[PDB]
Amino acid sequence: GSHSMRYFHTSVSRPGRGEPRFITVGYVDDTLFVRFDSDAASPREEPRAPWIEQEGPEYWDRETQICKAKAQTDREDLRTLLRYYNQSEAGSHTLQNMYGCDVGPDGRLLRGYHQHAYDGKDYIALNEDLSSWTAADTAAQITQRKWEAARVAEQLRAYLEGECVEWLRRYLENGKETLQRADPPKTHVTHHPISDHEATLRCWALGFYPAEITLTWQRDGEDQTQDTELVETRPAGDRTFQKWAAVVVPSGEEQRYTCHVQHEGLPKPLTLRWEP
């Protein structure tokens, strides 16, 4: 199967209320595995998945050094960005950075990523070539010039093609019991009277991993895309996800409506109906 690793970073300034708060998390696929919060008592990067716990002290020390360094550079960057946008020191601002890599079934790099946003807007992104930049505006072009002069993209290419892929592969092995296990949805259809003349059929998908899923309703074998209410996929809190799809159906016509479920964990795609 194909897999991804991502490190997410957010700093939020709070003028008059100390230094910015820095939070970073790491994911493999849809699994959180590490976290760091600058406001914790004596902050360290901490494990959040069983398979990373076996990394030795030297791993956690180095990770913690990087996290603390990134908090420091984010503090500096937030000050710089005030200058670049001619902003006062009075407001709270947000700096985000994501980076990581995608690998195919055979473990080869499919795509690397490295991108920044300021106040929720694209700032500067490394292009797919891992060699050139997309700057969103004239402020980010200043950064682009500095990063071109320092050959930052070359550094990122080397990391992304190298360590990013290599360590992702190590984690997929060490975490093979979970990271390489797709859990199918448990499914059922419920019935909710609106009046004597119609009711909602709700098709539930619960307990699935990873989050990617397709849930649809058909009527007489025809897609009902425009009349289906589909909630956003949501975390159950135990690693798994939930979703539902609903259609409003005339009383007594329920057998004409089928719920269709596709997920990596299923032996085959499902077709379900309401069963009184």
Binding site: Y59, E63, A69, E76, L81, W147, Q155, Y159, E163, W167
Partner: peptide, 9 residues
């Protein structure tokens, strides 16, 4: 694991 080198804007 994370990338070691620092970067500022």
């Amino acid at each position: 694991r994370r990338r070691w080198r620092r970067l500022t804007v």
